[PDB]
Amino acid sequence: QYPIINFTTAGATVQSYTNFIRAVRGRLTVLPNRVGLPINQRFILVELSNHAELSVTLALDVTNAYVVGYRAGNSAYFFHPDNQEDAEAITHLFTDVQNRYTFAFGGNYDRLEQLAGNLRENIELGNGPLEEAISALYYYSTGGTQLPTLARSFIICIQMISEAARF
Amino acid sequence: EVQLVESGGGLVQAGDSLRLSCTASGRTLGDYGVAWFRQAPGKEREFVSVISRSTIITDYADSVRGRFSISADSAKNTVYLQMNSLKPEDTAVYYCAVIANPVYATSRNSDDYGHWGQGTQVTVSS
Secondary structure (H helix, E strand, O other), X not given: OOOEEEEEOOOOOHHHHHHHXXXXXXXXXXXXXXXXOOHHHOEEEEEEXXXXXXXXXEEEEOOOOOEEEEEEOOEEEEOOOOOHHHHHHHOOOOOOOOXXXXXXXXXXXXXXHHHHOOOHHHOOOOHHHHHHHHHHXXXXXXXXXXXXXXXXXXXXXXXXXXXXXXX | OOEEEEEOOOEEEXXXXXXXXXXEEOOOHHHXXXXXXXXXXXXXXXXXXXXXXXXXXXXXXXXXXXXXXXEEEOOOOEEEEXXXXXXXXXXXXXXXXXXXXXOEEEOOOHHHEEOOOOOEEEEEEO
């Protein structure tokens, strides 16, 4: 029911990345954000894959392109939403997942930087970091990834996808 | 120091309503995320419902959605579970617990919870 866009870091080029961000940007809403909108057109799904054969699905808000949460295998993780409407809305994402978590924090930079123990500007971006970020997000579902590395991997995703589509 | 006690359980008929109470002593319950779990005869401990400390996130198991309703009352230091349209499949011992893993506001995994109560028994007959 939600639009899915694919991207892989395996054999990734400047073109494939640019086309990917173009595809994401082409789904962002431009009409004045109404309230009580159809739930089916509130979110876009970004299915990320890497060399390591791992795969995760990010959930992006159509209004601002920001990550509201993600799916890794049979588990789903959401940032704490800001309001009741957003809270109710995210209960319609990844609804058949058995393991379901809402973090005790929102997905904003100040918080993610505090968690990663570093600032945005110092966090190396690129295809190589996004490779590692995708694994880190995946292996979080199996207890492998620690919270600072997770928080760091979110920043890489948000900057390379959300920020990249936003301008 | 927190101590959780479940009450409200008993014998009912199918289609009936029932309201459970997770009462706390030792600390304020409004300072926790509170979940209900249950264990039916011959079955594993099952996630049922959770309410976040912030009170805006709730979550339910698929088998209880539309039927069960979680809510909190700090006036009494209690978290409720309204159970409607009860069926024999709901027969179980109902436990409540506090979310003990500070990374999550809500979880369906029992490992993320601590300070489990004794449990209150709910039996739905047909």
